[model samples]
Every structure is written in C-alpha cells, then in structure tokens.
Target: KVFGRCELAAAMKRHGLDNYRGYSLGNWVCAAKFESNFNTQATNRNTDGSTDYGILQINSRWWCNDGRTPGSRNLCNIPCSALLSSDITASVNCAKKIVSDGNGMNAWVAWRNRCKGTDVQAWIRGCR
Candidate 1:
C-alpha cells in the first residue's frame, strides 16, 4: 500500500514517532519520503546480501530476520516480512527499537542524507 504524506504523518504520529528519541515527527516523515516513498511493501536487497524492508526500510542484517543475511542479529525479533504490513505497527515498533539502541535516527543513512539537520516541517505540513 502507498500512503500520501498526510496519511503517513497521521499514522506515524499515532504510533509514537512524534518526537521519538528527540527526532521530530517530520524527521520520520522525511525519512519515509526518501527511504520508501510511503510504500508499505517496499523492499531492497543490498549487494552485501542484507535486505531493507517496508516504509521505514528496516534491515535484515541487524533488525529483522530474513534467513539470508549472514550474521544477522535479528534484534527486532521478527521476520522481515512483518515489516511489510500496511498496518505499520510492527514497523514502527522495530524503528523505535533501532533508535532506542542509542543510534537514534542515524540508524538510517537516508535520514542523515536527506532529513538530519534540515527543516523537515514540510514533510508534515498541513497534516498537523
């Protein structure tokens, strides 16, 4: 499923991405914009064999188990398939887990490139 900016913003906030770990709601919105364009079923297989899944693009190497990534920690304790749910509850929880590990939003390099230190207010504009 694909989500518009407002819908994504609303769902994200409802799942507690608002100001999560000092990252504002816009940060999450911006990251999603760049990472997956709000596509719930988005998936990317890395050259190194790890895969990124879902709107937030949680990785198989450290977060979700895909049964393919070598040395996967599966720290999120879920199948990578769970990240693709349109509901986003599991995805949000795994994202929170990633940030809570002290990495914060920096867990996603896309966040650093396009979202970090920028005015992401536009990502959530009119959705508040």
Candidate 2:
C-alpha cells in the first residue's frame, strides 16, 4: 500500500539502491512485486519453520531477529517487525548489503522467476 513505481524508485534512490548493483529499478521493483506485492508487512513461513519477512523477504534464518528461529543469525541486526514500516530505511539498507554480497538480484528468487531475461526498462522509465 505504500508504493508505486515512481515512489519505489524515489525511495530506492534515497536509500542508495538506485542501480547500485547494476540492476535497474526494473529488477528491484519486479522482484519486490512477486515477493510481497510491495507490502512491507508481508511474511512467509518457510518449510524449515523459519520465516521470511518484509517486502524483500529478508529471512529470519540469516537476516533478522524473529526470536523464534533456532540458531538464528540476525545478520542485519534488525527486528523483523521493523521491516513492516512505511519508512523503509532499515529494509532498504539491508537489501543493499545483500545485493552487494555479489549475486546481485539473483539473491531474490522472484528476480529469477519474473525479471531475469525479461524487458525490465518499463519499471525504470523516468526514474533515472
């Protein structure tokens, strides 16, 4: 409820994601859409009983503190609830670091499923 393509672009830019990993706004937005419909509060229960949280689906397994996952790492050092905000600074920062881990948008399964090898410029139009 807190996003459109332009708003997403603007926010990403403010948080330093504007094409930071050689992925255009198209790659970012498309992955977020399939991942959570841009809903910040989105969560998914993984089969292993860990959960993925927020628009980027940062997992409790390695990325955030959900408090219930055993051996959880909370690598991003954030509470999962913090990601469910209209203010997305924390989530955006974590996403930037994740992309910087070198796999780029391939870190997101949705990017592979919907954005890769597809025309992604439409989501990037006028945002640069």
Candidate 3:
C-alpha cells in the first residue's frame, strides 16, 4: 500500500536522478493507477503464450533484451522481476526514465490531459 518511497529514492539515486521529489511521486502514483493498479507482480499473456511482467506489466521477452543493467538501458530494458525486487519507487523511476528520459513528471501531466485511460505508451507521449 505504501508505494515503496525509501526504495524508490534509492533507485533514483542509483540512476543519477535528482530534482524528482516535487512531482515524481504524484506522476508515479498516477501512472500506477492507470497501469496495473500498483500490482508489483502483475503480468499479462499473449495468444502466443508469451508473457508480460511486473508492476508496470512490462513485456519482458521484448523489452528486456537490451540494457540488462540498471543504467545500461532505459526502464523498458530492465526486467520487471528485478524492478519488483528494487521496490515500486525503482520501478516508477525507471519507467519515468524510459518514457520521458527524466522528464517523466511532465509526461504524467500530459497523460492526465490526453489519455487518462490506461495505455502506458500513449501516456508516455503525454509527458511531452
């Protein structure tokens, strides 16, 4: 229920992120509400028996192929399982980076203005 603030801060630090305190939490919370309802281990399935993974419900088989390390790639590359272990903050921060390149809060605002539904990708564009 907490959304893992402490761990989130740690993850942000690990990723060299700063100046995110003002709106990052709000953006993340909003994104979670729109995405998987904050389910840390949420997953989905495809007709081909492939699977999505973790809180943000990322498609591991597709997005995890590159940038396996924390900072190597974007959030899209980090495995959802690894993100889950780091806590929701880490996951959200990574998501912001992937979607907005550190401009994620703006993306969240865009999402609120535009989609307001669910589509993470569309919401990402909202950040712009």
Query: Backbone clashes per model, in order?
Result: 0, 0, 1
> TM-scores of all models?
0.96, 0.91, 0.44
Q: What is the TM-score (0 to 1) of candidate 2?
A: 0.91
Instruction: Pick the winner on TM-score between candidates 2 and 3.
Output: 2
lDDT of 3 by residue, 11-59 (tens): 4445544335443333444455445555676666645544555555554
Model 2 Cα shift for residue 48 (angstroms):
0.9
lDDT agreement with native, every candidate? 0.92, 0.82, 0.47
Clashing pairs in 3: 107-127
lDDT of 2 by residue, 1-128 (tens): 55877777778778877677777777787778788888888899999988988888888888889899998788788998887888879888889878888788888888888889998877767764
Model 3 off-target regions past 4 Å?
Answer: 1-24, 47-50, 65-77, 101-128
RMSD of each: 0.9, 1.6, 9.0
Assess the local accuracy of residue 82 in candidate 1 as a C-alpha lDDT between 0 and 100. 94
How should the candidates be ordered by lDDT, best one leading? 1, 2, 3
Candidate 2 structure lDDT: 0.82
**Most TM-score-accurate candidate:** 1
